[PDB]
RNA sequence: UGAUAAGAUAAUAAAUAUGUGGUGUAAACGUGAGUAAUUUUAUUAGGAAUUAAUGAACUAUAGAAUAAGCUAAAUACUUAAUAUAUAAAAAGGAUAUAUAAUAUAUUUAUCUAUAGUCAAGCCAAUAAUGGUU
RNA sequence: ACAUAUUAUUAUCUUAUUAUUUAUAUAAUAUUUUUUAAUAAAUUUAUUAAUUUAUAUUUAUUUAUAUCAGAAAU
């Protein structure tokens, strides 16, 4: 669409590379701190640049966000348990407990 | 061994009993379940031995907190960890909640300033913790006769050993003082001649909402010498001895009520044989000063 | 989407050429099962617009075959479809606006042409 | 036992019925 | 705020799902061992006992959401209060505004009742491989 | 013949667990109940630990029946 204004929070795409997170920070070279390149570059045009599904999926999506006023920051993806998922929770449990606390 | 120490451990079983679960609490205390709780073989926390059955806790005297907080060592933290420790349980807790009276406050505030050196850490911890005495059903310990006046005392005595003379932040912290009074009933009638000694020490007119004029009313103590009727009625009036001898001493305006002589003449004379409160207490202050 | 009972699409056709029925299905039973009832058919895949109708102003058209009073009736009883279907019902002119969430809601977009119903 | 003690009550009830069919026929 | 800085309070911005809680896994997926039918399959414009104070979870409407205890605390749990012979309940959170913790407003949840929707239990009739060595 | 494996059955033996049903406790908890100390507050009351009292809910043991399974026989 049309190429949204840098703020105060994302003056440049480093600073937006920063905030979404996801590791997104490895790809500053990428971009080039190029305001432009960030709003214009589709998936096509980022996979020929070498960035991996995952990644190139989420930039668009914040990139979505941003052009729409809606917040950027990091959302974190999901994480098994300390004791591990449920399906292996029982036995990890009994074996940690049995190591710990005796 | 101590008096101090007995009564820590008197204060220490006190809580640990109303802080123990109330499922458990018939097996670790009752005697007779002594086996019982063997057997269920309970872990006690910290995943240490299985919990070991207690002597049955009975109500404590309020005497022991007096007793522990003037064992406290000229320079220590153990009144002020003691107080968090305690006021840190439940509000559910009654017994814990209930069991501190105005009188100890008034004596945790003359001690921590006088003997253990650390009035400002006390009136913090008071102050700070006072929202919950609300919402724990015992505002009353938050008075005018046992926590502004000892704690305008304790100011006209700091202001002085420290000679601080802003007019500023003397009112801010008046003003903060009769904020924090949740039992509003004057008495005596020191107050007034507590905050109008102190207006003058700072040079400020003093001006607080709801300290309607009262005329001295000071207990006097008979003629008659008691034993423990007499020894437990100066330790009652000890806090008001420390607050006439203060005021006079401080500035000689107060000489002008002659009620305040009549009672540091029956207080004084009452057990003139013992030594004196007052005396003793300014003496600590200047062994504190000196470190 | 929510309930017992959903209005939502049941995959049909071969592998890279999706057909979809419009079912009205338990929750629970799986997505190909056979369902309460088929309300109609959505065919995603645009009929395509030779060069000549492109530039002549033909715009390609997306078919769906829909039982209107059927499917006005589980709305009705309180059946709950699923986003895909939402939008297709909007379209139709079944649902209104307030089906619309934050995210679709095209509260500023020009309208090139407006719902006409028609008999042929 | 409870188990002995139905089989015979039962096998008394077969060998009345077993009879009412001779008495009967 | 605390006369010296340990703490407390509020606002703001983050962190924590190795603590207590909620919802989710009766489905779907896979398989064909058992099963020859008091049980399983299929069928019928079949039936009654003439099927619960069951809603499972959405829809429509109406009303309610109280007091203690227990836990560190709670939308946890327990005991009570009041609600269709009568019986049988509940829960707050977020955000604003005004007050001196309370009240409204918005938003999202909780409970009950009535109907709908989805969905259950039971029975009959008829049919379902080989051997009477 | 028979040595094996598998399954089923029982007027038999042993039996986990569970359900149901007995008897018992100076059993535990709560409330009630009879008193009794200790402690505390106030100047009788409260709390805790005991005892008496019934009540409900549990627990231990115990009686009987049924029961996974195994044994023996067929
Ligand atoms: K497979
Ligand atoms: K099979
Ligand atoms: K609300
Ligand atoms: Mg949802
Ligand atoms: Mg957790
Ligand atoms: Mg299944
Ligand atoms: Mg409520
Ligand atoms: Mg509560
Ligand atoms: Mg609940
Ligand atoms: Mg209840
Ligand atoms: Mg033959
Ligand atoms: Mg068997």
């Not at chain 2, 003379?165 to 509003?184: C, M, S, T, Y």
């Not at chain 3, 649902?95 to 006409?116: G, I, P, Q, Y």
Request: proline content about 5%; some cysteine.
């Amino acid at each position: 669409s049309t190429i949204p204004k840098p703020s105060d929070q994302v003056p440049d795409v480093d600073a937006f590379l920063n905030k979404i997170g996801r590791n997104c920070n490895e790809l500053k070279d990428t971009f080039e701190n190029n305001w432009n390149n960030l709003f214009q570059w589709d998936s096509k045009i980022l996979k020929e640049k070498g960035v991996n599904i995952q990644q190139r999926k989420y930039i668009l999506k914040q990139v979505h966000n941003y052009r729409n006023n809606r917040p950027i920051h990091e959302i974190k993806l999901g994480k098994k348990s300390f004791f591990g998922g449920e399906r292996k929770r029982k036995a990890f449990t009994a074996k940690w407990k049995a190591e710990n606390k005796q | 061994a101590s008096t101090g120490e007995i009564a820590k451990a008197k204060l220490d079983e006190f809580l640990i009993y109303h802080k123990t679960d109330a499922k458990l609490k018939p097996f670790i205390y009752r005697p007779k379940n002594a086996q019982i709780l063997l057997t269920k073989d309970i872990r006690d926390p910290k995943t240490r031995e299985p919990l070991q059955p207690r002597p049955p806790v009975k109500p404590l005297s309020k005497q022991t907190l007096n007793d522990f907080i003037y064992s406290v060592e000229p320079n220590s933290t153990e009144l002020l960890d003691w107080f968090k420790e305690w006021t840190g349980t439940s509000i559910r807790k009654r017994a814990i909640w209930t069991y501190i009276s105005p009188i100890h406050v008034q004596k945790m505030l003359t001690a921590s300033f006088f003997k253990i050196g650390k009035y400002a850490h006390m009136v913090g911890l008071l102050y700070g913790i006072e929202h919950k005495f609300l919402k724990a059903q015992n505002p009353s310990v938050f008075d005018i006769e046992h926590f502004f006046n000892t704690n305008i005392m304790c100011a006209l005595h700091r202001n002085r050993l420290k000679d601080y003379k802003d007019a500023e932040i003397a009112q801010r912290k008046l003003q903060v003082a009769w904020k924090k009074v949740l039992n509003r009933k004057n008495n005596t009638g020191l107050a007034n001649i507590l905050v109008a000694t102190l207006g003058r020490q700072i040079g400020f007119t003093p001006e607080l909402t709801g300290l309607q004029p009262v005329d001295i009313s000071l207990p006097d103590i008979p003629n008659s010498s008691s034993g423990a009727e007499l020894k437990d009625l100066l330790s009652k009036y000890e806090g008001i001895y420390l607050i006439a001898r203060t005021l006079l001493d401080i500035d000689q305006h107060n000489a002008q009520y002659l009620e305040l002589q009549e009672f540091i003449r029956q207080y004084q004379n009452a057990l003139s044989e013992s030594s004196d409160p007052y005396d003793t207490h300014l003496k600590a202050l200047g062994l504190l000063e000196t470190p | 989407t929510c309930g017992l009972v959903r209005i939502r699409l049941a995959r049909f056709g071969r592998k890279n050429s999706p057909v979809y029925n419009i079912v009205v299905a338990n929750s629970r039973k799986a997505r190909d099962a056979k369902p309460i009832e088929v309300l109609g058919t959505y065919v995603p895949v645009p009929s395509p617009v030779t060069k000549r109708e492109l530039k002549r102003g033909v715009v390609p058209i997306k078919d769906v075959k829909l039982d209107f009073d059927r499917t006005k009736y589980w709305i009705g009883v309180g059946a709950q479809p699923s986003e895909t279907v939402t939008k297709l019902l909007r379209k139709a002119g079944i649902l209104n606006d307030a089906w619309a969430t934050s995210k679709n809601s095209n509260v500023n977009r020009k309208v090139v042409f407006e719902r006409m119903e028609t008999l042929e | 036992s409870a188990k002995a003690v139905k089989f015979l009550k039962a096998q008394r009830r077969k060998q009345k019925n077993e009879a009412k069919q001779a008495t009967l026929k």
